[PDB]
C-alpha cells in the first residue's frame, strides 16, 4: 500500500505562549498517509495537560494533526520536552525535542 511518513515540527514555548506562569508547547505532525498517528510526550512520562487533536484531511489527500501540553513556565529550559510520534503504516517513529524559542 502507498504510505507517506509525517514531518514533525516543534511548537516552541515562549513568553507569547505563556499566561500566568503556565506555558503551552506542542508538535505539529504534517502531511502523512494513511491514518492513524499516535503521539506521546517524554515516552509516556508526561500525561498531565496533554491534548492531541483529531487529524485534518487536506485536498492533497494527506493528513495533519497537532499535540500540545501545558507546563509550568519555571520548568522551561530545565525539563526536556520530547514529542513521540508513531506512524505504524509507514513503520516510522519520530521524536522531536521542543525547546524554548
Amino acid at each position: 500500500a502507498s504510505t507517506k511518513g509525517p514531518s514533525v515540527f516543534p511548537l516552541a514555548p515562549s513568553s507569547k505562549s505563556t499566561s500566568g506562569g503556565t506555558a503551552a508547547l506542542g508538535c505539529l505532525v504534517k502531511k502523512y498517509f494513511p491514518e492513524p498517528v499516535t503521539v506521546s510526550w517524554n515516552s509516556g512520562a508526561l500525561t498531565s495537560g496533554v491534548h492531541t487533536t483529531p487529524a485534518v484531511l487536506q485536498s492533497s489527500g494527506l493528513y495533519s494533526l497537532s499535540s500540545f501540553v501545558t507546563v509550568p513556565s519555571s520548568s522551561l529550559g530545565t525539563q526536556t520536552y520530547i514529542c513521540n510520534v508513531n506512524h505504524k503504516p509507514s513503520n516510522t517513529k519520530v521524536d522531536k525535542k521542543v525547546e524554548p524559542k
Partner: protein
C-alpha cells in the same frame, strides 16, 4: 455541565518549517464547553479564508473540548504582513490572539 470559555494560544511557523520552505500557523483552542466554536483568521486586519483548516472539537479527559485551527501560508506570505491573528468565537465571547514575523 458548567460553561467554560476557551484558552487560545497561537503558534507562529517554526524556524524549522520555514527553512523547509513552508509555513503553518497553529491556533490551539482548549478547555471549552459546550463544544461549539467558530474560528476566523486575519492577516493584519483583513479576514482570510484561503489555507484554513479546523478540527472538529473533541472531548478531553477533563470533559471539556479542544480543537486546532491551521493557516497554511508560504514563507513569503508570512514575512510580508505585520501580523496574523486567530479569532475564536464561543457562547457570546470572541477571543483573538496575534503573532508577528
Amino acid at each position: 455541565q458548567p460553561k467554560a470559555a476557551p484558552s487560545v494560544t497561537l503558534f507562529p511557523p517554526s524556524s524549522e518549517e520555514l527553512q523547509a520552505n513552508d509555513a503553518t500557523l497553529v491556533c490551539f483552542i482548549s478547555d471549552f464547553y459546550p463544544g461549539a466554536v467558530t474560528v476566523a483568521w486575519k492577516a493584519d486586519s483583513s479576514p482570510v479564508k484561503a489555507g484554513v483548516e479546523t478540527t472538529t472539537p473533541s472531548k478531553q479527559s477533563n470533559n471539556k473540548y479542544a480543537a486546532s485551527s491551521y493557516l497554511s501560508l508560504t514563507p513569503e506570505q508570512w514575512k510580508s504582513h505585520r501580523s496574523y491573528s486567530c479569532q475564536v468565537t464561543h457562547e457570546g465571547s470572541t477571543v483573538e490572539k496575534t503573532v508577528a514575523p
